[PDB]
């Protein structure tokens, strides 16, 4: 369908990171002049990235996503190393942030001018997850209705911010801020700019492993690459209009202070100010870790089938079936990031390995443009476009060792831990035979423990 290719794909890319990241670009850019440039410079950069995946999703198109696209290209311990990162780094830490933001927009309507304690925002973050991972261990068809009510709340909040931000300039005192004092200034050109970009890049993502099923179910067939070029400028439009409601109605010191900017817009604008904003921002962040648990199970079914990822996972329950050993594995790793210090220390830790996973996936496209031609590419983009993409993406990582190398130091530590469990995983000689009974011993204990049965082999 012509328009429904956009309407499905716009609500997918609008995430709940828009209620977090305006504070994080503002403290790494200085003024709203250079802050609104970062929202536009992240605007264009993600049209380039989604075109690189609009073609790469169509060439191979097996099943299993970004992992399986690299499984075709390398097909060895590079594939497991890419799998060892997403189970441990990308998928846990991005769910913690949305859970941590669900806390601070729920505990900030009763702490109006002060700061929420660190130790209490974590225990409402953990509570939100463990509550929500247990719904998905129960009825899936009940949890899918729960996915319905949170799409509507994410749009009612982001419009009511606008229509109150629209009349606030129309009531009087046009250009109530007019601040661009560091639009030419406060710019280190290496450190603070990239750190402001990581907050902007987080703000809408999921143009990578979410669009391939989005096109597939209608089969409109290769009018999708225009359908994202229509779509992603609508998202950069909404993500810039919402900052215009922030910089006018708030100040640049009231914004960088608080943790919930959306309630400061809500507090000043209206006196009801409690039934509206932290509810609608609260339901919106409550859905992005719900729907991150529907789609979490798909990865396990692909990895265990290929001989990676030992087969305790990818087993499903009897009555009221739901992938139970997988959801337990994700929620444990999610709560292991409750040992973290700052939320923008997590976004900088998340987006380091997100944007190295993306960059090697597209270097592997050029080496599949160099080597192995005639693979029936339904979509081929101009090859000058992906080399715009890598040369920027090496520029993000190479400055991220000049800036905060200790978190990337423990990030390369955890991927040297995936190397011996690779050699223990598939390369290992089953010669000593003491362990082969034990692997069967350990696995059948968990099946008796959880009541989970294998796939229909």
């Amino acid at each position: 369908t012509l328009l429904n290719g956009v309407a499905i794909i716009v609500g997918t890319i609008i995430g709940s990171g828009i209620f977090v990241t305006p504070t994080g670009v503002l403290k790494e850019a200085g003024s709203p002049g250079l802050a609104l440039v970062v929202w536009a410079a992240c605007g264009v950069f993600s049209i380039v990235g989604a075109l690189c995946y609009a073609e790469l999703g169509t060439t191979i198109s097996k099943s299993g996503g970004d992992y399986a696209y690299m499984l075709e290209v390398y097909g060895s311990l590079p594939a497991f190393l890419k799998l060892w990162i997403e189970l441990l780094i990308i998928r846990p830490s991005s769910q913690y942030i949305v859970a941590l933001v669900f806390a601070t927009y729920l505990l900030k309507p009763l702490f109006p001018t002060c700061p929420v304690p660190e130790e209490a925002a974590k225990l409402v973050a953990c509570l939100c997850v463990l509550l929500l991972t247990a719904v998905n261990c129960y009825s899936v068809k009940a949890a899918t209705r729960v996915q319905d009510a949170f799409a509507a709340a994410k749009l009612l909040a982001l419009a009511l911010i606008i229509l109150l931000g629209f009349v606030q300039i129309g009531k009087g005192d046009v250009s109530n801020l007019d601040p661009n004092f560091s639009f030419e200034g406060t710019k280190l050109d290496v450190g603070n700019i990239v750190l402001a970009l990581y907050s902007g890049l987080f703000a809408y993502g999921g143009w990578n492993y979410l669009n391939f099923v989005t096109e597939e179910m209608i089969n409109p067939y290769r009018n999708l690459p225009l359908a994202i070029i229509i779509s992603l400028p609508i998202v950069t439009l909404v993500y810039v209009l919402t900052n215009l409601a922030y910089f006018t109605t708030l100040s640049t010191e009231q914004m960088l202070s608080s943790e919930a900017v959306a309630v400061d817009f809500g507090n000043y604008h209206l006196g009801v100010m409690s039934w509206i904003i932290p509810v609608f921002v609260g339901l919106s962040c409550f859905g992005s870790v719900n729907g991150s648990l529907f789609t979490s199970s798909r990865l396990f079914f692909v990895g265990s089938r290929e001989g990676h990822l030992p087969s305790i996972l990818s087993m499903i329950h009897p009555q009221l079936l739901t992938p139970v050993p997988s959801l337990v594995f994700t929620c444990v790793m999610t709560l292991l990031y409750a040992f973290s210090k700052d939320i923008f220390s997590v976004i900088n830790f998340f987006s380091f390995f997100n944007w190295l996973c993306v960059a090697l996936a597209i270097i592997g496209m050029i080496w599949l443009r160099h080597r192995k031609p005639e693979l029936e590419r339904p979509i081929k983009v101009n090859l000058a476009l992906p080399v715009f993409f890598i040369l920027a993406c090496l520029f993000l990582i190479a400055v991220s060792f000049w800036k905060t190398p200790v978190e990337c130091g423990i990030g390369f530590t955890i991927i040297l831990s995936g190397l011996p469990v690779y050699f223990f995983g598939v390369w290992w000689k089953n010669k000593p035979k003491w362990l082969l009974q034990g692997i069967f011993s350990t696995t059948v204990l968990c099946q008796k423990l959880m009541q989970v049965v294998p796939q229909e082999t």
């Binding site: 505990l107 009763l110 702490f111 109006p112 001018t113 002060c114 700061p115 304690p117 130790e119 209490a120 225990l123 409402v124 953990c126 509570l127 463990l130 509550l131 247990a134 010191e253 030992p310 087969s311 087993m315 009897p318 692997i439 069967f440 696995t443 059948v444 099946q447 008796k448 423990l449 009541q451 049965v453 294998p454 082999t457």
Partner: protein
């Protein structure tokens, strides 16, 4: 594939494994409700918030006295429309208001020929004045209109019969509020007979239209007891005086005035100015100019300044000049009578590029005063230190705490900042980051040690340290 099949599992998993499955399921919702109220504990025994104290617009930054426009610009430009281009400079200082005037019709020394409602045509007309208010209000700089009647003679208040003189003030407060001014000022009310009854009536009139309007008043009095007679029935009345103007030049003498004037009023809003009309260089030597400023921008109240206070405008350093209203200097071409008597450092332009100048000190302080919620309306507590110091702390609810250290003597000392009296909410740490200094030669950003803090002769320090326990 290493497993037990669907049918083989339903053989093996049934017996008493059902009970250890219902036990781990029931231990979940207990370990969930255990984490539930374990968070609800922390949300109840948490220190709450102080509610914010409904500030007015003058609370939030300095004011600025401009008495002589003639000087304020120069020759040829001494008018209201030539003043209207200066708001780019006045917002460079981040002031929040202007003491403007007096601009009304004063011939000389005559009651019947002094009309407060008519402007003096040496400045412009009412339409020029309405151009000024409307241009200022776009930058959010309010305009306070000075209404001292005989602003050209010896006695300011026309020594003959007075109830018609106050009647001229009684309608002039009605007139200019309709034009939309946001505040007034009378001066020299020691020349007013029964000041405390007319001021309280005019305060009823300035608050009679709205509550966003103020009424400053001046006197040459430095008597602590005489001021409080004026502030007896009136509490929402600003009142500048020469109370701090008498020197002493010592800290414990200066400490005694600030504490007592706060103690005798309690905790109301002050207005920390040296005099009612003049400059700071009238009452201070050349090296204390950098040192008050900082103290002025940090005490609880509204600092009130005059033009040239930020550049060190010294009338004694430049001959051929009226003490009452010195040449508002701007550039090297600012003193047209004797060329070469003005150095590069002296004008607005030459100091606007040096990061160590006195005007560079004024913009950093007026920045922090208008943004930091401690220096906006945090509470004031001083404490004892060495013999020639004056140190104090500004601190609000949970925001950033501030520490000021001033050395009013010319002997280089150490700190000795014994707190011993402050609450735990404003308890000092061992180390604290340095924000600025008056003398150059410090590492701005490095946390200094307060017990090993050594002071230089005439050096101020502003430090900061966060809320902790």
């Amino acid at each position: 594939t290493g497993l037990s099949k669907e049918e083989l599992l339903k053989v093996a998993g049934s017996p008493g494994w059902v009970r250890t499955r219902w036990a781990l399921l029931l231990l979940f919702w207990l370990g969930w409700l255990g984490m539930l109220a374990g968070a609800v504990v922390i949300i109840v025994r948490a220190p709450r918030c102080r509610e914010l104290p409904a500030q007015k617009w003058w609370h939030t930054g300095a004011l600025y006295r401009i008495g002589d426009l003639q000087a304020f610009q120069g020759h040829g430009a001494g008018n209201l429309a030539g003043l209207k281009g200066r708001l780019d400079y006045l917002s460079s200082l981040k002031v929040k208001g202007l003491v403007l005037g007096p601009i009304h019709k004063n011939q000389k020394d005559d009651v019947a020929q002094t009309d407060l409602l008519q402007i003096d045509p040496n400045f412009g007309s009412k339409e020029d004045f309405d151009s000024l208010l409307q241009s200022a209000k776009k930058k959010s700089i309010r305009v306070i209109l000075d209404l001292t009647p005989n602003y050209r003679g010896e006695n300011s208040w026309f020594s003959t019969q007075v109830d018609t003189v106050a009647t001229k003030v009684k309608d002039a407060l009605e007139f200019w509020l309709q034009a939309g001014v946001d505040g007034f000022q009378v001066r020299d009310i020691e020349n007013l007979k029964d000041a405390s009854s007319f001021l309280a009536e005019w305060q009823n009139i300035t608050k009679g239209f709205s509550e966003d309007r103020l009424l400053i008043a001046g006197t040459n009095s430095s008597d602590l007891q005489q001021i409080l007679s004026l502030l007896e029935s009136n509490k929402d009345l600003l009142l500048t005086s020469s109370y701090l103007s008498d020197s002493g030049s010592t800290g414990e003498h200066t400490k005694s005035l600030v504490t007592q004037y706060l103690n005798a009023t309690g905790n109301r809003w002050c207005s920390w100015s040296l005099s009612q009309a003049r400059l700071l260089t009238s009452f201070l030597p050349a090296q204390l100019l950098r040192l008050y400023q900082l103290m002025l921008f940090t005490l609880p109240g509204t600092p009130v300044f005059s033009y040239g206070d930020e550049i060190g405008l010294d009338a004694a350093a430049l001959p051929g000049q009226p003490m009452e209203a010195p040449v508002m200097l701007w550039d090297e071409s600012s003193f047209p009578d004797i060329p070469g008597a003005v150095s590069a450092n002296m004008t607005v332009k030459g100091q606007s590029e040096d990061p160590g100048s006195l005007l560079s000190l004024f913009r950093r302080l007026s920045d922090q005063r208008s943004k930091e919620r401690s220096l906006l309306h945090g509470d004031f507590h001083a404490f004892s230190a060495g013999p020639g110091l004056f140190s104090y702390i500004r601190h609000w609810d949970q925001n950033e705490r501030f520490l000021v250290v001033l050395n009013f003597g010319d002997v280089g000392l150490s700190a000795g900042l014994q707190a011993s009296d402050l609450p735990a909410s404003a308890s000092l740490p061992a180390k604290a980051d340095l924000l600025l200094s008056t003398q150059p030669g410090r590492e701005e950003g490095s946390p200094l040690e307060l017990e090993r803090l050594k002071l230089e002769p005439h050096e101020g320090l502003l430090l900061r340290f966060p809320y902790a326990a």
